[model samples]
Target: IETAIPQSEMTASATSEEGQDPASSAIDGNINTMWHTKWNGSDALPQSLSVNLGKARKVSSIAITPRTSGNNGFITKYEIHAINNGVETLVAEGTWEENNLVKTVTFDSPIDAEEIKITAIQGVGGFASIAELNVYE
Candidate 1:
């Protein structure tokens, strides 16, 4: 299935400082660019990147690219959450192979929600990054 949500409507909590690695980079439809977490040397794991679908959607799958330009800062593990009617709920969870390739997770059933949140639990170099995040219907 194709992504029903638009990348332009997404927002992330961790934004780049120099504007070079802004949060919008992840959903920019380019694998060459990426969304980098705040690089203060103390940037921890479990970082979050959320997408607002502009309205409720039936999200069935999500594909995440660990990194594009670099080998480090790849999210190894993550969780998926959904928000419906202002109520948040856990939809799915999975682990990445750290290969810098797009890792996809398909839910057992589609979820009806207004937003989707990805929580990075672990990374290769203790950093979080996303080359792209695709949400499918």
Candidate 2:
């Protein structure tokens, strides 16, 4: 039950940005997740999953699996920002480790705003790939 979400899906369910109208959305289907540096050197950094929410809320859990080929995927830290009126103000923080997946972090701070920003801080050699990001109330 794996699927690749196009970059457009990130724009979906997002309420902070203005260029979402013609944004690209991932096609709903099987996803072949992989990471590449593109030619050799990329200071821009590898891609990861980023989503925008209308409000800052607690997430139930996240299920992430590294691409089988690249068994070196890892996560050292997770930053969850609570965006109010579309601007991230930082709400809670958590850390993840190598070979670690399915993190369930709860935020103690009160959040009643729009959008939650999630980012992976560390990995083995490059960026981290997430198969799915499931948010629950």
Candidate 3:
């Protein structure tokens, strides 16, 4: 059955944090605040953000919203990875349009994953931002 997993109980993480925008903000269920790459010299592409679902679940798709307050950090190409029991697998990979609209990626099928990771393979401004990252079953 298709189900949207609540983000409240999950733990979000990323390659790095930009000032007050921690990775957790991406899962905070708010599109206003976002998680951005480090503003220091570490702002680089190919950064990743993920969430531990607290337990394994069937992950079918992910809906990601770009930062609403900024014109930078829009992810264009991404790869979706799933991890279970320390084993990682590539669930899906595709490119997105360079817009701020909520982007959703659906896997070929449901993946029983304990964690889901989204890597920004290509984006703008040498950085990335996720306003809200939602997991679905």
Candidate 4:
């Protein structure tokens, strides 16, 4: 079932610029706001975006939305990990067709963890941007 989470209680981590598009913007429940990486003249493969759940919970699925208006910065191939007690476990991995709408990855079973991360193995516009991230319990 779909669940509602408190965005204020969550924290985000990513490779964005110092003063722009911090990880928090991705979970603010606003598609207009997004997290994007800064141009360092480097094409960094496997960029990571993570969310700390603030406490342990059963995570069933992960949904991500790309920048709605642009085709660039959408993730192509990615992997998801669940972190419990600082130990990381890979839960899901797949390739995504380029789209601006919400793309979901449902695990074979619910994972109990305090944090989850999505790593972009490939991107569209030389960078990865996420408009929103939803975690279902």
Candidate 5:
């Protein structure tokens, strides 16, 4: 069943880095990264937006807010990835199960990494404002 998590906790990661990453001695840990796609005055998705959340062993939770403007709900899929800091290698690639609204998906056993990126593969009515992007350990 789909569950609901607190919004404050949802955006908590968006606000600051909680600690230091064990694998990296150069930087402190960070919450998840988020990218906002604004309406480009066209219906075509202008490529993908990427965010780099420094190395994480596992990502416990992920959530997205479908772009709802003029009551239009448009959001297609998400490309999840685990990559090296410099190489931009892909370790894990997955797709969202399709949704239209605020939804939360939980993942078991976090993956080991220092960076991640997500790309929206759907939503054609223009722009999808990613109201919320979250990650938890």
Candidate 6:
């Protein structure tokens, strides 16, 4: 609510990621680096990046920052999921304007999430990249 969740509690992960640009980069608090989908192939669309919060938390919002450069792997559409008790629930899903600016999604109210996952449904350059992911309390 007042500030972002602590990175210490945010263990990052993803489906398929570039070796150097793995999912950990997204939560590393660095804009110059990013978590990119496997560069070897474009077939891995709808890629996913996730965060394990260590335990359930009342999360109110989330922010996604694209790579530092232009819109090379900017996401066009996404789905946010909250995992509680091993059940994945869709908390948010929508299209985000194509831009390099950070995109934020605010929920109507805080949702309980032990883990959070954001799936990139569509993006530019046939891939996805996330520089950072901030989850608010």
What's the TM-score of every candidate structure?
Answer: 0.87, 0.55, 0.93, 0.91, 0.52, 0.94
lDDT of each: 0.76, 0.42, 0.86, 0.81, 0.42, 0.88
lDDT of 6 by residue, 44-79 (tens): 678899899888888888889998886767999899
Candidate 1: stretches off by over 4 Å: 1-3, 15-18
Which lDDT tens digits does candidate 3 get at residues 19-108?
788999999888888998887737577899988998889887889999887667798888888999879998888888888899988876
Misplaced by over 4 Å in model 6 are none
Lowest-lDDT window of 10 residues in candidate 5? 21-30
RMSD of 3: 1.3
Instruction: Give the candidate number with the greatest TM-score.
Output: 6
| Best candidate according to lDDT | 6
Better of 4 and 6 by lDDT: 6
Worst 10 residues of 6 by lDDT: 1-10
Report the Cα lDDT for residue 5, model 1.
71
Write model 5 residue lDDT over 23-103, tens digit each, in one string. Answer: 121112222222334334343553343444544335565655543333232445445655554556544344443444656
Residue 82's C-alpha lDDT in candidate 1? 94
Alpha carbon lDDT at 45, candidate 1: 72
Clash counts for the predictions, in order: 0, 14, 0, 0, 7, 1
